[PDB]
Amino acid sequence: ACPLEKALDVMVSTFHKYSGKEGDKFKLNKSELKELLTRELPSFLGKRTDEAAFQKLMSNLDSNRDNEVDFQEYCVFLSCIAMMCNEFFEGFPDKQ
Amino acid sequence: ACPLEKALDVMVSTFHKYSGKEGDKFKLNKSELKELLTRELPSFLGKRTDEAAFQKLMSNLDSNRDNEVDFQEYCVFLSCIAMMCNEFFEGFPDKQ
Ligand SMILES: [Ca+2]
Ligand SMILES: [Ca+2]
Ligand SMILES: [Ca+2]
Ligand SMILES: [Ca+2]
Numbered sequence: 001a002c003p004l005e006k007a008l009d010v011m012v013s014t015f016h017k018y019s020g021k022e023g024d025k026f027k028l029n030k031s032e033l034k035e036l037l038t039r040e041l042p043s044f045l046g047k048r049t050d051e052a053a054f055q056k057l058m059s060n061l062d063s064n065r066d067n068e069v070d071f072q073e074y075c076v077f078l079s080c081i082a083m084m085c086n087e088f089f090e091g092f093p094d095k096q
Numbered sequence: 097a098c099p100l101e102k103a104l105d106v107m108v109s110t111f112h113k114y115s116g117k118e119g120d121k122f123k124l125n126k127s128e129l130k131e132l133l134t135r136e137l138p139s140f141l142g143k144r145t146d147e148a149a150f151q152k153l154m155s156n157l158d159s160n161r162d163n164e165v166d167f168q169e170y171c172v173f174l175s176c177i178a179m180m181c182n183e184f185f186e187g188f189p190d191k192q
Binding site: 002004005006008015039041042043072075083086089 | 103109139179
């Protein structure tokens with residue numbers, strides 16, 4: 001098996017699972033971003049599912065300032081999450 | 097247990113599976129990158145497993161010019177792969 005190839009497949013399909021619900025089918029608007037985070041990455045925002053948190057996230061992800069998250073911005077986001085997971089790979093911050 | 101979260105875990109674990117083999121345990125050298133690409137992402141390089149292909153790949157990934165690929169650089173690489181896969185999601189080039 002090639003788990004990494006299957007992982008990349010899931011990263012692509014999961015974006016479209018939500019991005020195609022409304023409007024531009026290649027970008028996540030606020031509504032679609034909320035659904036994606038809540039259903040697919042619940043560990044990221046955890047308890048922070050209020051509007052202030054979602055607007056902060058949209059602002060952080062939306063690098064080109066078009067009010068939506070496109071595939072490239074979404075991969076930067078996932079890469080950020082992966083970098084944070086990577087810090088705890090040993091079950092403690094091996095760094096110090 | 098959410099599939100996207102599992103995908104991120106695979107991204108993380110697969111880097112360490114190879115980066116820890118030689119030298120700096122947190123970066124991929126040429127030999128480690130070859131094994132990773134070959135065993136885990138064989139569809140990427142396809143038939144281009146020659147020395148010239150690997151040198152070009154290493155210089156493309158190693159954006160800080162330290163001769164190895166760190167986890168951040170590896171996430172940029174995986175993101176590039178996903179972006180390329182994503183271009184074909186509709187079954188035709190949906191672009192301009
Ligand atoms: Ca949309
Ligand atoms: Ca945007
Ligand atoms: Ca190494
Ligand atoms: Ca480097």
